[model samples]
Target: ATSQDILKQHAAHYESDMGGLPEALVQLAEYAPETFDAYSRMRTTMLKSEADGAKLPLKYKHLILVVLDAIRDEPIGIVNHTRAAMNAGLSVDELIEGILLGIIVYGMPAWGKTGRKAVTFAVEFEKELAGK
Candidate 1:
């Protein structure tokens, strides 16, 4: 059964981070509401502010995701987390440093693979934000 309540909450959770829940999330809510609901709950716990009991600051959490995404060669995750990290107050310098650290652990292939793209996207994304 499709639950409007769950769907609305999902939209709210993703609206800020991603302009809105991407189409795939909508499908997840429709086709697998149970799993989607559980995932949403987990995401809320991880992303909520420290006042709400999350251990790390939002900036650091997103920064960590950016690094992991880079190591895994997940460009979309890198871009999304990079934007989220910036929105959470991380500077481009700090963002680049995080990506560099990932490259050091994952080695040069990480750079040739996704780290380079992440850096380029972050710089361009900052410029776009500035122009706005």
Candidate 2:
């Protein structure tokens, strides 16, 4: 279930986002598969565990990343968060509100990208679901 079968599982998590593995994680794997495996395990324990816990719902928690990335205009992060938020059990419509919140705080165009991304990601998920 890990990236043990990284190549085979590529795109399995997100239809086109490197199977939900982060770029750093991918680099770790690329640098050396064994090193990547070790780092991945450490990451699973230290970082992922925080979000993986029930104390905070990954859906709501991940929304923060969604908005934050959108605010900073971090497209890659937003794209990844798009899949992460949804996979954490977020509805695309539900996601729109978070981006909308960013609009007022971040002003037009800046946060607007978030809205566009939310819509785009949501539509993509819908298509994926329909395909299934």
Candidate 3:
């Protein structure tokens, strides 16, 4: 099926599960219809293009989720942190190291015991590709 078909299918699913569609996504459907459609199509394609029972690889999916989660909280922080991390030659391995450092300083309890989640995200990210 085409991207537009995938978008429509996703929108239907979203509406059903969430009880409503987000305004922004609706706007995307209206304004950048092709882009939205293509995105949905790509995601569906990836899901179907798995091998060896591994799917799209945990790291790739996890990194996408991590970026999505971070952006949900603070876009500016995500952008700045990503750029700063990249400029510092922070490879995926290095980023995982930094996350470990952060856990040591902040202490897991300080952030609702989210340290493990952070580490999991980092490790999953690194497993995808050597660097992000």
Candidate 4:
């Protein structure tokens, strides 16, 4: 299939999983078609493999929910919020350590943005949870 065809298929599949195609995926299609195709292929393969297994795991459903929620919140667009969510499950030191993984995969700038957002989100979640 052509890139556009693959992108359309990806969007449709993703929409069925969530409520609609996320802007991130759309942006990926526009800016990084190769990545978009790769991601879509992987997702399709994973879904097919799970279906072939005869039972979808609850954790997979939860993971989809988490991803959709984060996408809706524009987590990557706002570094602080992303940081907050990550930090909620880990200490500052641990968060920093985790960022190393991101840096290795996505480079320093990407990791930096993620770290900042996660920290911000952590603070925001705390305040909201505390009924501030």
Candidate 5:
């Protein structure tokens, strides 16, 4: 219930048609409901804090999160945050540049994987814009 609530809400409001908070997080939530509450609250806090004050440029903020997600090796990381970053005013080329920064942490492996995923996403999005 706890995992479902947080993940579902994040998944719903965000644009990822197929994304989750990672199996490990879900398992942790199941393994420790008592502590998960605090974790859940802060998770929402970190993401939501941006819009609350509009302190920094939203695209760059999301770009940072996208790199962090890639370094963490969460497959959903790029898939999810890339869209948000682009939606926040980042161009697709800039998105690739953001993903490339992941090379600093894990080198090209992260960059290759994330870039490939992003290309697929761009392909589908392009098709959507084709007007059939």
Candidate 6:
């Protein structure tokens, strides 16, 4: 029952914060509860807002992740963090600007590859929000 409780609460928090649990995390939680718990806790710590004791706002944190992921060309991370940032009320214009900022620090490929994908994801997310 205690193990079940840990799984339940962690999954719940993830869904609440991130919208849903990815299948990889689901599998990890099923097969490696302790590791998943640790990862989940760390995710929570990193994503917390000022009120939760973190320095940055939750939306800004997601924005930073989106840029970092875009620079690194991690498609899944770009989309996921983009969605999180948008869900936290980040505007598509602001999101696109942030993605473009990576170009100065990195290079054009940051825009050609990940930045393009990230902006596309943000635009798609804005469309989805409009439908809602």
- What lDDT would each prediction earn against the true structure? 0.79, 0.65, 0.46, 0.51, 0.63, 0.82
**Model 5, 3-107: lDDT tens per residue?**
666555555433332234556666766787656656756655555535577566667777777777777766676666666666566666777777787777688
Model 2 agreement with the true structure over 20-97: per-residue lDDT tens digits = 667766665666676665554554443242335646566776677778888888787777777777766788887887
Best by lDDT: 6
**What is residue 117's positional error in candidate 1, in angstroms?**
1.6
Q: TM-scores for all candidates?
A: 0.84, 0.62, 0.34, 0.41, 0.63, 0.83
Candidate 3 residue spans exceeding 4 A from truth: 1-7, 12-22, 47-64, 71-132
Regions more than 4 Å wrong, model 4: 1-3, 47-59, 64-132
Off by over 4 Å in 5: 1-28, 49-51, 126-132
Q: Candidates ranked by lDDT, best first? A: 6, 1, 2, 5, 4, 3
Any residue pairs clashing in model 3, and if so which?
Answer: none
**TM-score for model 3?**
0.34
Please identify which of the two predictions, 1 or 4, would achieve the higher lDDT against the true structure: 1
Cα lDDT tens digits, model 3, 6-120, are: 4667765444223344556667776777777776556444433124264654334333433443434433333333333333334665444444454354454422343334444
Tens-digit per-residue lDDT, 5-123, candidate 4: 86776776565444355677777887888888888888655544234572654233333333333334445533432332332333444444444454565566544543445545555
Instruction: Give the C-alpha miss distance for residue 26 in model 5, angstroms.
Output: 4.8
**Number of the top-ranking candidate, with TM-score as the measure:** 1
lDDT of 1: 0.79
TM-score pick, better of 3 and 5: 5
Model 6: lDDT of residue 10: 84
After superposition, candidate 2 runs with Cα above 4 Å error: 1-18, 24-52
